[PDB]
Design a protein around this nucleic acid. Structure first.
Lengths: 954, 317, 54, 310, 315
DNA sequence: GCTCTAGCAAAACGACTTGCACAACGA
DNA sequence: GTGCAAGTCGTTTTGCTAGAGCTACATGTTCACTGC
């Protein structure tokens, strides 16, 4: 032992520190001591110093373990006064000397900028066609064109480049501003032969950079969508693209000749357009090693989708701008669009192209700063300090665990499962976890999404109260997305002018409540014209349906992906009752999660039960997304290992993982602990289980036992409600019947939810009491069997703060062979051998939380594993991972063949009164509507259009 | 002054710095690096006199005045990738470190003349490579089997198996007719060393990852340690005036190959044991680096490196 | 050879002393340094401090 | 700012080099309008960071991607502190790092050990040096206007005689001494032209009069410029042609020799007589070096001797 | 707990003059006059083993209390080796203040008193003491390379002859008067061989501080360093200083002297003469002697010797 | 842009002044 | 009388802000004598 002691104390503390040390060693400096001493002596010295240490106390102890080497033993007090080796800073200043603000990690911003600008210079060139110009100037009958303008543009682009050319050749020719010869027009492969020319994306036709630009131009209104959807073609997908994929129509040959007619010439005459394109090409050529990267750039989802995002957002904005003259040559004969109000020519063609290019460049420069300039929630007391009631102490365990892996997640990404049981206030835990993952030093941004077919004002208000959040903090998005019908209606209206990009970002049947500042929006220059989207982005935290975010990956047509995609790219994502989806819907969910990982967001799954195959599939999606992402942000080359996490009533845990194998083995370990720990806790409920042989639904449709013991679809619910109303109560029983179904108007659904939330010796003092499947997201209950998830979660409603099951589901009573087809994942491919229904004692998530014809749970497990893990499952082969293992995302193919909210479709309920043909917690539509119109500051009918919607079948 | 500063013999300076998220500047005549700390910016001192080299990682920047001072003191500056990754890598290209060698401090003129005298005849190079390996083998034996520190730390190794592996490899080295066979022997030697190290350390089965892509702690530490070895090699070859380019073994897949050829002298004799040892302890990259530099100082790695270069030039006459 | 240095300087001198020592050793306290160093180096150190002593 | 049109070498000052959006950008007081934006980034370019500048590791990455040499130099670019080593082009190295290996080291070594050829190189160096004296002292009158009016016939006779001597004598040992005699006469001529009075050349910086100090500064800058030339060529400093084989940093002194008496010496006497500040002297020297294309000349000479030695 | 450091492992031992020892802000300190100003100096009591107070110094009660808590011996002595007091036939080299608030173990005390009250057993103890003295001096002067490097060239043969003769002399020495006469002869032998072993020429050993030459001065000063370490050793075992075995019949508190010889010849003599050769100043001599004493773990040896003699005298 | 120099102001630091307690809690 | 603690008050140390310059000082060689 040979010690050197150094002090960094302050004010009163340093007087104390001197008082201690001076008794053990000679003072050899104003703050330093150095002497030999026994190991036991040193230990005692350390103990004495620790016994009374101010926050100002700071002492470091160095050991000279021999000739020419020294070591650091321990530090007492504020460790921030030293570095790891025990050195001390020479000077410190609050001035910002590091200036980390100046440069950013978007290591591919320039590439996307160049590709976008090139596309913008060509994006709407096809509108120079004689056919299009004639359509522009015709105010009479509107005609659908032989091809959409973009396909014409792509063919023009391919003709200009020429087949077999290297990227350098066409870049050089474009850059050489001396060239103006149009002889290449003769080379143009007019599609109007009897013979069809090969697809421009074929190996012989266009080089990589050209292919990238070509895809970016043709995909600026709708993703390409063909008929071939096999794996062999999906792996080369850009090449198979053809005219038929891009909305080609049937028409007379004369019109098609007009499409390939350019009497007024191409934009090449314009001075700017030639100069600007030459400059852009020169800049692209001077960029280092871009050409070699091209082939990898074509397949990169990140580069392409960001460029598409920026491309429309520019084109949409400029198309809404009033015309101007300074751009280009005012005497240009061709035009881009017709004013919607005045019905006259608005913008010159070159004016439009150049404007879009300019704005795209501005966006490219702006985008990296969005995460810097957007509103955020910071230093909210509710999240931070601890909770007092032990019932919720586990939530503190979770918050600490997240706080223990913050910067690791900040670097590598995060994938957490909140696996806890119902009734434990999961909402607060989820919010706290996400707030923890944010940088404490500028604040958080995240979104809460659930699988409801549509979301009401009440669920959002409930979230607001649970989180202690103001109207300027938490935004709520109501309703759900619109259908293709209205979009086609509208494109029929608007394609007459060709400004299909004018379609609103968010369907006006949607609406957003949020009470913050709008003018501060960094994107006001392009989103102020649609306050709804601007509000969506501005809100630090938003709650909505999962439905509202899918347009990110599912917006096959129109610019609906813009808003949600930006939301993902600037905020984190929480999914709650994610498992409530039906089997055909998960593939779309996987796509969403994949993109969430592709654009740098962090994901937190929340549910009371979660099949292992499901989480494995999603995790592999997120892993792939993150791996793609890390090629373009942060420190290049760093290895992929996501920071996985688990949360529970009993525990909280986290670990880094690089691949699915280790992840699943860790997840299974956590499940094993949860279910084993759960079995220690006493049972809370007891299940139990019909002289109904008739076939007539009314008669067969036509409590006391429970009271003495202790005190699947809309249409059958209505039928039995009518039957009960007719029958009435038995002797000595007063029945209060509260009806709350999914087809009530949102206004009414909100009111009913409010009443139920409020009402459900002190109990009898409440006003109303003294006076006297959508439920899955009491003293006793009666349940029709649908699945284990419903069985347990309904069971979770009982004594939360005794149940009898129907032995079969009404569709089984009707004899339908796959009786559970609608509620469960039974299908003619995958049936049960029968529908007659140890788990009866303990109603636990165990059976489906673990993975082990006669066991529905087994069939569901098999369906999940087959659908999203297996490569060659039974039936048609369209497994999930094709989304990221191929260039699939370049087309609408997978969104077509694995659609979201699939099947029979609604129509939002032009007067159609002819079609119309005429308790506790009840609501009067007129009374609530009148009150809420005042709360909303709207006319009664306008309020009705906003909240009277119902998703009825046509 | 440029003199009175390069007085500490380069083979005895007792520091080697690895820095991330900071700006290397000059302040009050001293060369310092500043780090953001939230409350304030903290200036940290750099003793250029007692320094072999700087390694600068991610989010790091340097100013010209600092270069003037570091060049005067004869300190190397190297820009590298983040904590164990190449600064650059694409397709089958790698650039582990980009070195800024001083040019205003003239260096001896003899070792260079010998080296360049023999460097242009493949056979003479091959003889040099043989000498490098024989030295490496010698260092391996001395360090693994005759060091009390590593043994006491818990690096109990099977003497007999190591001895036969060394003898087998050495004979193969003598048999080596040309470079390709030499490299294959290098590969076989290398992993057999990994195998011995691992199961002597209770690590169990192990495999060496590729191009710094490893996940487990052992691979990450090995990748990081390589840069420390690179730094010492770069300064060792500079102080003799030999340009980095004139490699003998790894030259034809690497820029500045001679650094890597030299680094192999110390890559396995140290580092490799320490990496697994730290992994056993569940150490943290900050600790592994600290301990590794302590071992390198105790073993006088730089001195051994410098001597070997002198000898092999010497031996080529 | 292993060294521990302490400075009791004040006013203008303290800044000069810091200017010299900081180039030979890491700083461990407000006024102290600790490092290994060769004998020749230490001789150079003392000579430099003497050259501009106050 | 293009410091050497032969080497594609650029000097950057009063600016930060950083990477934003994946492109290397210069934060400068002129913003978008600075000429630095016209810098071509390719494997042919080589940077020289000057006074008041800093660079980020990210930039080093992008430059390495593009294969651009980097080096730090002091005011005006004369004192070269640190730089990247440049590769050597031979058949047994072959990395694909996109860095333009340079083949001059092999040419240099191919003859450096053959004493006769080494002597021939020394002669070639001195031929160039003298012809640069005759050029700057007589052919161009800029110095004449500046005030360095000196006799021609004596200078021409002396230079002619020394040139006649260069083609003779057996070994380095004479060449060194013949140059020394020419040096002495040149000093005398310069002092007479400047009306500086008697002059004696002290060495190792023992002089006190202005002429001596200005000569030292001028030589220091010349050495720095030569170091830059060699670094661009990749030749190590130790392979001297005319200085002794044991002289640390000999080659740079060999290269520096071809401007000292051509461009530094007159300016040293002029500035001393004019009573200039040291800073003014430094600025004047750099201006003279820029006007004479010195660095390009010293590059051309080294390339010429390499090709001639075959 | 200030008394965690085991006494034999404690670092420092202090000699003070022209200063006041006082408490200040909880610390124990001594103040020196420095011209216009006065300077406070820190005494790390927990790491010290004893204090020597010399000419023109004073202490305050609070300091005494703090020292007692840390179990630090305190001693008043004359300046520069002179006795604190001396009449013509009287000497009091040091006046010792031993802590009494802290309670020493008992077993060693009980053994000591058990055997101390009979002549023969005291004779046996004295023989053990002298044998240990010879052991240490032999080991130090032969097997230590440090002194050889320092320039302590000694004749091995003469040393062996003298030491063997002395060892033979101890055995069948009848009565302590003979025994002490013998060790005085041994001292003379050592003085001479060391002097001729360090090129000091002829040297004559002065007596009770009457010397003038540097060698006598340094060796007289070193006597007190030895006294300090002996006193602390005796107190640590818990033996009263009065139970001497040899020197009690002129000295007061004799046993401290008797224990001290364990140190005096083996360690002080070389450093004293070596310093005289170098002509070093007194402070440097004390610093070196201090440093050697720590190097040899001397206090530990004194303790071990007392333990061993207690055991061997038990039966 | 980077660093050095000069002048300022705030804060930390150590010595002085005064009023007063008079201590230290197993066997 | 000795020492503690609360309050004062003169330095002394650090960082902040403008404003101004923009360095870094020999280098002819070979070989015999001198330290660890």
């Amino acid at each position: 032992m040979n010690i050197l002691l150094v002090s960094q104390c302050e004010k009163r503390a340093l007087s104390e520190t001197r008082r201690i040390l001076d008794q053990f060693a000679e003072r050899r400096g104003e703050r330093t001591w150095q002497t030999p001493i026994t190991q036991a002596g040193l230990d005692t010295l350390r103990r004495l110093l620790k016994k009374s240490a101010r926050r100002n106390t700071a002492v470091a102890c160095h050991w000279i373990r021999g000739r020419d080497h020294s070591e650091l033993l321990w530090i007492v007090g504020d460790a921030s006064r030293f570095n790891a080796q025990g050195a001390v800073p020479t000077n410190r200043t609050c001035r910002d000397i590091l200036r980390k603000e100046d440069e950013n990690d978007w290591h591919s911003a320039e590439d996307i900028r160049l590709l976008t600008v090139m596309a913008a210079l060509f994006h709407d060139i096809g509108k120079a066609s004689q056919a299009f110009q004639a359509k522009l100037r015709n105010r009479g009958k509107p005609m659908a064109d032989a091809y959409r303008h973009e396909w014409v543009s792509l063919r023009l682009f391919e003709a200009f480049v020429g087949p077999g050319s290297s990227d350098e050749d066409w870049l050089r020719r474009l850059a050489d501003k001396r060239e103006t010869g149009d002889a290449w027009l003769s080379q143009l492969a007019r599609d109007d032969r009897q013979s069809a020319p090969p697809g421009p994306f074929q190996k012989s036709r266009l080089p990589p950079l050209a292919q990238a630009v070509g895809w970016l131009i043709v995909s600026h209104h709708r993703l390409p969508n063909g008929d071939h959807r096999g794996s062999a073609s999906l792996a080369r997908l850009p090449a198979p693209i053809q005219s038929q994929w891009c909305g080609a129509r049937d028409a007379d040959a004369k019109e098609k000749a007009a499409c390939w007619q350019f009497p007024h010439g191409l934009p090449f005459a314009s001075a700017h357009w030639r100069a600007r394109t030459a400059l852009c090409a020169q800049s692209m050529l001077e960029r280092p090693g871009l050409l070699a990267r091209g082939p990898a750039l074509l397949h990169d989802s990140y580069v392409m989708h960001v460029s598409r995002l920026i491309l429309m957002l520019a084109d949409h904005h400029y198309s809404s701008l009033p015309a101007d003259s300074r751009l280009g040559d005012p005497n240009f004969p061709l035009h881009a669009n017709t004013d919607r109000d005045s019905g006259k020519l608005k913008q010159r063609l070159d004016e439009h192209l150049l404007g879009v290019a300019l704005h795209s460049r501005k966006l490219a420069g702006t985008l990296p700063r969005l995460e810097r300039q957007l509103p955020r929630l910071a230093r909210h007391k509710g999240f931070t300090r601890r909770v007092e009631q032990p019932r919720f102490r586990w939530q503190d365990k979770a918050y600490d665990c997240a706080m223990a892996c913050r910067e690791q997640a900040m670097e590598h990404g995060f994938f957490g499962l909140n696996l806890a049981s119902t009734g434990c206030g999961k909402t607060l835990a989820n919010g706290r976890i996400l707030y923890a993952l944010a940088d404490p030093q500028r604040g958080a941004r995240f979104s809460i999404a659930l699988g409801l077919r549509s979301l009401t004002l009440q669920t959002g208000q409930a979230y607001r109260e649970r989180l202690g959040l103001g109207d300027d903090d938490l935004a709520i998005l109501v309703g759900g997305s619109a259908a293709r019908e209205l979009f086609e209606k509208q494109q029929e209206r608007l394609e007459r002018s060709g400004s299909e990009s004018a379609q609103e970002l968010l369907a006006e049947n949607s609406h957003v409540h949020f009470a913050g500042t709008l003018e501060d929006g960094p994107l006001r220059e392009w989103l102020g014209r649609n306050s709804a989207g601007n509000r969506l982005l501005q809100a630090p935290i938003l709650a909505c349906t999962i439905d509202h975010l899918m347009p990110a990956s599912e917006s096959l047509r129109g610019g609906h992906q813009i808003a949600p995609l930006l939301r993902l790219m600037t905020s984190d994502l929480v999914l709650d009752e994610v498992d409530d989806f039906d089997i055909d819907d998960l593939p779309a969910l996987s796509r969403l999660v994949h993109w969430a990982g592709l654009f740098g967001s962090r994901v937190l799954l929340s549910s009371a039960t979660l099949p292992p195959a499901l989480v494995q599939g999603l995790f592999e999606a997120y892993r792939s997304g993150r791996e793609i992402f890390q090629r373009h942000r942060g420190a290049p080359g760093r290895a992929t290992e996501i920071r996985c996490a688990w949360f529970d009533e009993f525990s909280s845990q986290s670990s880094a993982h690089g691949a699915v194998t280790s992840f699943s083995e860790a997840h299974a370990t956590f499940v094993a602990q949860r279910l084993a720990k759960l079995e220690q806790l006493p049972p809370r409920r007891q299940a139990q289980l019909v002289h109904a042989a008739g076939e007539a639904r009314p008669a067969l449709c036509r409590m006391a036992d429970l009271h003495r013991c202790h005190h699947a679809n809309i249409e059958p619910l209505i039928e039995l409600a009518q039957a009960i109303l007719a029958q009435g109560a038995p002797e000595g029983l007063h029945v209060h019947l509260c009806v709350y179904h999914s087809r009530h108007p949102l206004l009414v659904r909100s009111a009913i939810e409010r009443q139920l939330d409020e009402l459900l010796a002190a109990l009898f003092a409440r006003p109303t009491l003294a006076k006297a499947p959508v439920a899955e997201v009491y003293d006793w209950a009666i349940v029709e069997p649908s699945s284990m998830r419903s069985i347990i979660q309904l069971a979770g409603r009982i004594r939360r703060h005794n149940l009898y099951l129907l032995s079969r589901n009404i569709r089984s009573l009707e004899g339908q062979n796959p009786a559970f087809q609608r509620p469960g994942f039974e299908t003619p491919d995958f049936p049960l051998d029968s529908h007659d229904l140890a788990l009866l004692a303990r109603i636990d998530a165990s059976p489906r939380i673990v993975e082990p014809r006669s066991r529905l749970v087994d069939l569901e497990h098999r369906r999940l594993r087959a659908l999203m893990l297996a490569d060659d499952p039974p039936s048609s082969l369209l497994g999930v991972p094709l989304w990221w293992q191929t260039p699939a995302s370049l087309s609408g193919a997978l969104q077509t063949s694995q659609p979201f909210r699939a099947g029979a479709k609604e129509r939002c309920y032009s007067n159609q009164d002819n079609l119309l043909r005429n308790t506790w917690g009840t609501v009067n539509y007129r009374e609530e509507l009148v009150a809420m119109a005042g709360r909303e500051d709207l006319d009664l009918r306008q309020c009705a259009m906003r909240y009277g919607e119902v998703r009825l079948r046509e | 002054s440029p003199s009175e500063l390069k007085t500490i013999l380069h083979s005895k300076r007792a520091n080697l710095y690895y820095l991330q998220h900071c700006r290397v500047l000059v302040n009050g005549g001293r060369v310092e690096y500043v780090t953001d700390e939230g409350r304030h910016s903290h200036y940290w001192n750099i003793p250029i006199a007692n320094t072999t080299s700087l390694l600068l990682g991610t989010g790091t920047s340097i100013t010209q005045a600092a270069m003037r001072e570091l060049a005067r003191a004869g300190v190397l500056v190297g820009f590298c990738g983040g904590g164990g990754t190449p600064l650059f890598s694409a397709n089958e290209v790698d650039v582990e470190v980009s070195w800024l060698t001083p040019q205003s401090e003239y260096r001896p003129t003899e070792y260079l003349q010998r080296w360049v005298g023999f460097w242009f005849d493949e056979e003479k190079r091959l003889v040099a490579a043989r000498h490098f390996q024989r030295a490496r083998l010698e260092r391996i034996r001395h360090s693994w089997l005759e060091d009390r520190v590593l043994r006491d730390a818990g690096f109990a190794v099977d003497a007999t198996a190591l001895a036969v592996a060394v003898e087998d490899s050495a004979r193969a080295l003598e048999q080596a007719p040309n470079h390709e066979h030499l490299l294959t022997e290098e590969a076989r030697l290398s992993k057999r060393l990994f195998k011995l190290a691992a199961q002597a350390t209770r690590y169990g089965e192990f495999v060496r990852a590729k191009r710094g892509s490893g996940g487990d702690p052992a691979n990450r530490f090995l990748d990081h340690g390589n840069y420390l070895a690179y730094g010492l090699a770069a300064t060792a070859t500079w102080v003799l005036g030999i340009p980095h380019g004139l490699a003998v073994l790894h030259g034809k897949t690497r820029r500045g190959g001679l650094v890597f050829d030299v680094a192999d002298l110390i890559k396995d004799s140290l580092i490799l044991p320490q990496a697994f040892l730290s992994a056993m302890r569940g150490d943290e990259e900050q600790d592994f680096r600290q301990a590794c530099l302590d071992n390198l100082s105790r073993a006088q790695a730089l001195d051994f490196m410098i001597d070997t270069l002198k000898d092999v030039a010497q031996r080529s006459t």
